[PDB]
Design a protein around this nucleic acid. Structure first.
Lengths: 209, 97
RNA sequence: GGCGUCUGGGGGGAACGCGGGGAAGUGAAACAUCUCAGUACCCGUAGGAAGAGAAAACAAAAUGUGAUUCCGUGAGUAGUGG
RNA sequence: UCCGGCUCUACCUGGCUGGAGGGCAGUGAGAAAAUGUUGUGGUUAGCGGAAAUGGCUUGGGAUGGCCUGCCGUAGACGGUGAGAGCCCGGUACGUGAAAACCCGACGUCUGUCUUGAUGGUGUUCCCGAGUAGCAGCGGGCCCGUGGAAUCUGCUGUGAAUCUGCCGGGACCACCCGGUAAGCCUGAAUACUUCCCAGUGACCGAUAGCGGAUUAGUACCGUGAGGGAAUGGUGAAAAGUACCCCGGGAGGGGAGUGAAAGAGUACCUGAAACCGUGCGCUUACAAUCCGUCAGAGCCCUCGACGUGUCGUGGGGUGAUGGCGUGCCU
């Protein structure tokens, strides 16, 4: 159990959270994380790429000249693969790259990725990013700089939290993600994880039950 | 294009940076203006011949309209609800340009 | 049948629908049954979708389901086949 | 609810229909044609939109490097003389409809129930006809006629109306399900000629559409039809004024340009192919055109004198030895 010190924009510590040993203390498995993060990237890649084969090129339906007597090579169309302008013989076709990864494999990847952050003291929890009902990224930038000095950070913010989300959007390295949509690739890509107190409890309660 | 014919502009970037001039023509299609006394070319004119010196157009992104005070200024707009007009306003001092 | 008068049709369109007609190269290491295939093509027709639809249905002794259509399974199984 | 006239006629009893309160629905499959009012509801034009002329250095040019500020609900993407959140178009975020069209909503309007419903008893009539069923020849169902059910086409034959009829894979009996030969029905579903906004571990001029350029154009064919090739000067045209040779083309001075090894035959400019200059070699010689030795000449790098060696490098090679292309 890791005790995460909760902070506030005013700089006053509020309380503490207890990260479960199940979720935040798994031994990282590099071979398992690599398979998972490759699976998400493959699902990101859209297979919109195609070329017209010898059959789908416009024309070339007639034997251009006789079989015998001409003195040139035997040719069966004006669009065969060897021609200029002919079809593409083994070309790319539009295909989907998403692959089916078992639920237990995917979940265990996230636990390993999160457990790694907890060990090195990168997981932070914050009650709220800014003063309510008024977005202001100058305040959010000052807060985030106080917490972590690293270039990249990931902010887990509840879906209904809009002043926080719309405040830290514009920042260069900051990525914001809903606690339900937490995934391996995003977690590993971050130097830190800046949870929201309502989000951190929601994530913990979702799995621990 | 926020810069009209007859305005006084300040050159921002180019070999003539810092020079002041008055706009002669505008080419809103290609976002270029011709400004008095900047970007002088040496043209070989054959008629009788001459080597003349005119002004080639400046891309409007490279000029800034001088404020009535005398400072370069981005132009903003105020909506006059009386006549529905849209008057160009200097950003620096808020006065009409 | 002839008049006079009112309203309609006629032609076009890339794909999708529905109802008809319907091959051969090909596989069978030949070939006629069979496959290719009710595919290609042709015909008549609409619509923004069409077709189907309110049990003369499944079911198997369970006091079960309860119009049609469309996905996933059942299943490349029960079967069928010079 | 009330009233009236009919139930041959008038009179007291049971029904039919019209006209006035009350509900109930409506552009629908359940009937149809309209008519107004409204809705910051939508579509078809747009408008606003924060922050550096910052200093120093390289430069033709700063958007490059270093150092300071500033905005950020805006650090999406393009452009501007080279990598721009603060120069421009914009983005985040807001605002905008006279008129037309589309969605709703409230009413005029339309139709229907109230002359009507609720629950009980024992019999006759009705419940879709040349249909169902059967037979002959076919189609199609996992099922190629097989023991061949259900569905269906053509030719004959041709029934019942509820203890009726049809299905429960020939058929028969029992049980079970259903009530054919009448008709409408939205949602779940397929598509993209076209229009709007986007995306790409897609192509980048022999690729991608056949078509970045006269494109189904040129051209071929009587006709159906077949069907190409051609993108890049520069930041700006500032596209070379003027003089000289020349009929011109073309060129040489001089100029623009950062560059003319950017001059409208224009970015970069390879190979085949074609020359010009220089060094070595070759006109007594049998040569898959090389290879291993190798005299001479020429160039180069060192140390030592005039030129002479060296853990040297290059180019040519007189002469000797060996030697029968590559792929199928």
């Amino acid at each position: 159990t890791l005790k995460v010190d909760v902070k506030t924009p005013a700089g006053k510590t509020d309380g503490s959270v207890e990260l479960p040993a199940e979720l935040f203390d798994v031994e990282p498995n590099i071979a398992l994380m690599h398979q998972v993060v490759t699976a998400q990237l493959a699902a990101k890649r859209q297979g919109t790429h195609s070329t017209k084969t010898r059959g789908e090129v416009s024309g070339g339906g007639k034997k251009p000249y006789r079989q015998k007597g001409t003195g040139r090579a035997r040719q069966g169309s004006t669009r065969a693969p060897q021609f200029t302008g002919g079809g593409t013989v083994h070309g790319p076709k539009p295909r989907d790259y998403s692959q089916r990864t078992p639920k237990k494999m995917i979940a265990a990847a996230l636990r390993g990725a999160l457990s790694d952050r907890a060990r090195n003291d990168r997981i932070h929890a914050v009650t709220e990013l800014v003063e309510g009902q008024t977005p202001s990224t100058k305040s959010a930038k000052t807060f985030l700089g106080t917490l972590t000095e690293n270039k990249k950070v990931l902010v887990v913010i509840g879906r209904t939290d809009e002043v926080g989300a719309k405040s830290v959007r514009n920042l260069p390295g900051v990525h914001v993600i809903s606690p339900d949509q937490l995934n391996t690739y995003d977690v590993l890509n971050a130097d830190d994880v800046v949870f929201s107190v309502e989000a951190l409890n929601a994530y913990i309660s979702a799995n621990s039950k | 294009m926020k810069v009209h014919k007859g305005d006084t502009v300040l050159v921002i970037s180019g070999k003539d940076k810092g020079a002041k001039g008055k706009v002669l023509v505008a080419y809103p299609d290609r976002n270029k203006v011709l400004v008095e006394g900047v970007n002088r070319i040496k043209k070989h004119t054959a008629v009788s011949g001459g080597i003349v010196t005119q002004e080639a157009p400046i891309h409007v992104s490279n000029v800034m309209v001088v404020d009535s005070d005398g400072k370069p200024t981005r132009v903003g707009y105020r909506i006059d609800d009386e006549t529905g007009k849209k008057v160009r306003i200097a950003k620096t001092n808020g006065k009409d340009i």
